[PDB]
Design a protein around this ligand. Structure first.
Ligand SMILES: C[C@H](CCC(=O)O)[C@H]1CC[C@H]2[C@@H]3CC[C@@H]4C[C@H](CC(C)(C)O)CC[C@]4(C)[C@H]3CC[C@]12C
Lengths: 237, 10
């Protein structure tokens, strides 16, 4: 762990602390939770809010601001839903397979999230993905590095300067690998890097299944009507 | 073609 690597980690920890609230206070300011589409307005509000927080986190990733605004846009567009699913793991509880932002009012289980016009083809893998990530028992240092590596990914469509994105990502990857060796207890560290990258692969797949269902959902104007302007700009019209 | 993303970036 160089000085540079320690800086990267500390910056990403504070960025996350500044941009994620598992008390979910602002969820009062959403359309309230409540057909198999009753939760769409509330959960479209939650996703829309959460995208703003991902952009907050993203801007504090070292080297991110050195990218063009074009590259920044496309990285956020493709990563947003993944980072939202990924960061939600901290509020996920295997006690009853729910995301429990403190209060019953803002406690979301399989029944809640199943009522926003997405089918279990998306929901079941999303819940299994949370269970899998809980089972890795990641350090928050590994959590926030995985979020940054998720965002700054040179294999995302529309990337102009892939070499610069790859450079940022390698520095993040090296930092994560070095952290796991120097700081993650063996045998927990065994192929942990590899299990983490697999989790990124599970996010890409959840991403494309979210895309397909959103493409469908959104082609119905009574549904697009319940979305937000930001959700329409990011996921498409 | 992403004015709201552009605004939240800046
Ligand atoms: C409650 C929880 C976060 C808690 C936390 O931040 O701590 C979040 C994280 C991931 C979210 C799901 C992502 C995939 C879906 C996207 C569509 C968005 C739409 C525009 C309609 O496509 C809404 C319904 C779905 C199932 C979301 C439900 C809420 C979930 C489970």
């Amino acid at each position: 762990l160089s000085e540079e690597q320690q800086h990267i980690i500390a910056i990403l920890l504070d960025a996350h602390h500044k941009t994620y609230d598992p008390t979910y206070a602002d969820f009062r300011d959403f359309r309230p939770p409540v057909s198999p589409l009753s939760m769409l307005p509330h959960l479209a509000d939650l996703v829309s809010y959460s995208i703003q927080k991902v952009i907050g986190f993203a801007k504090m990733i070292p080297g991110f601001r050195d990218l063009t605004s074009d590259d920044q846009i496309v990285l956020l567009k493709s990563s947003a839903i993944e980072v939202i699913m990924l960061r939600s793991n901290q509020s996920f509880t295997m006690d009853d397979m729910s995301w429990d932002c403190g209060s019953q009012d803002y406690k979301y289980d399989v029944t809640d999230v199943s009522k926003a016009g997405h089918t279990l083809e998306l929901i079941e893998p999303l819940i299994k993905f949370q269970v899998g990530l809980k089972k890795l028992n990641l350090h928050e240092e590994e959590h926030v590095l995985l979020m940054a590596i998720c965002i700054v990914s040179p294999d995302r469509p529309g990337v102009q300067d892939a070499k610069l994105v790859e450079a940022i990502q390698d520095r993040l990857s090296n930092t994560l690998q070095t952290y796991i060796r120097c700081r993650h207890p063996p045998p927990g560290s065994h192929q942990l890097y590899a299990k983490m990258i697999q989790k990124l692969a599970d996010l890409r797949s959840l991403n494309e299944e979210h895309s397909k269902q959103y493409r469908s959902l959104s082609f119905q104007p009574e549904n697009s009507m319940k979305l937000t302007p930001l959700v329409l700009e990011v996921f498409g019209n | 073609n992403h004015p709201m993303l552009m605004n939240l970036l800046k």
